[PDB]
Amino acid sequence: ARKFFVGGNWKMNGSKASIKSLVETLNASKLDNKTEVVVAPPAIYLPQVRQALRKDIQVAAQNCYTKASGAFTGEISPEMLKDLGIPWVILGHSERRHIFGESDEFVAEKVKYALDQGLKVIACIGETLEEREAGKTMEVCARQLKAIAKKISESDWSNVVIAYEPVWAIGTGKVATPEQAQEVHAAIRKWLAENVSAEVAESTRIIYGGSVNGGNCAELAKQPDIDGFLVGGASLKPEFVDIINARK
């Protein structure tokens, strides 16, 4: 069965002191050994975290670029991440797609380059409120996924986790039910089956990237096509532990 997966996206949040506290809390907590756990600090805190954090939680960057090196002021390469012992990267997050204009193709180029350099990737997809109102949830997810599928091989999906972000229920005032989330996750899995392969569909974790907290994580985790979470704000808090432990 697919291993339950809980990622924590810290986004642009943290100080040395707050991160020291966050890490200390994780280091003193009893975690379900059946959960694969990844945390994504801001880039400048990656060293602090990889040095202090328990080894059974892996670290991710929040973004990277599409080349090994060169004249790209402000960008980081997958080679640098590997060099510092950062095994994961989050790519195509809604905030990068919408605020920083990252296109479907640019995201797909990053996913392929990161995989080729030996990173594991949390690849983010999802639809806006306007797109959902139009009945375009799967049109959008299919488009975003197709761009990735055109760049990566069937085998390459092995080290991909798909994060479904209900952008329509992130910062909009709308909320998603576990049933609504499940419906999308099942449809994404069907897309994988029909476009990649049945084996990719059955193997690939599809994690929920909407609002996840200690209070709702158990009900979400019960859904049969939800393989875990890409947690936002709760990832900065002690209740992240409860989310890791959502199946217990």
Side-chain angles (χ1 to χ4, degrees), residues 98-118:
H98 302 284
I99 306 162
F100 299 95
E102 298 193 2
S103 77
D104 294 338
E105 293 67 35
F106 185 39
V107 173
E109 185 181 10
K110 292 178 176 193
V111 172
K112 180 51 164 162
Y113 195 64
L115 291 169
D116 281 354
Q117 291 307 128

Side-chain angles (χ1 to χ4, degrees), residues 16-28:
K16 288 192 311 192
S18 75
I19 292 174
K20 182 177 184 283
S21 175
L22 189 170
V23 169
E24 286 170 352
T25 293
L26 297 183
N27 282 355

Side-chain angles (χ1 to χ4, degrees), residues 117-133:
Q117 291 307 128
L119 302 189
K120 302 173 175 184
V121 175
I122 299 162
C124 303
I125 67 178
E127 89 286 19
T128 67
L129 182 51
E130 294 74 25
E131 291 162 344
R132 188 169 181 96
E133 289 176 337

Side-chain angles (χ1 to χ4, degrees), residues 1 7 26 29 73 75 126 130 138 169 178 213 234 236:
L26 297 183
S29 297
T73 294
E75 297 298 304
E130 294 74 25
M138 281 306 303
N213 54 56
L236 305 177

Side-chain angles (χ1 to χ4, degrees), residues 3 49 54 58 117 163 198:
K3 189 170 180 176
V49 175
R54 56 194 285 168
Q58 294 79 49
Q117 291 307 128

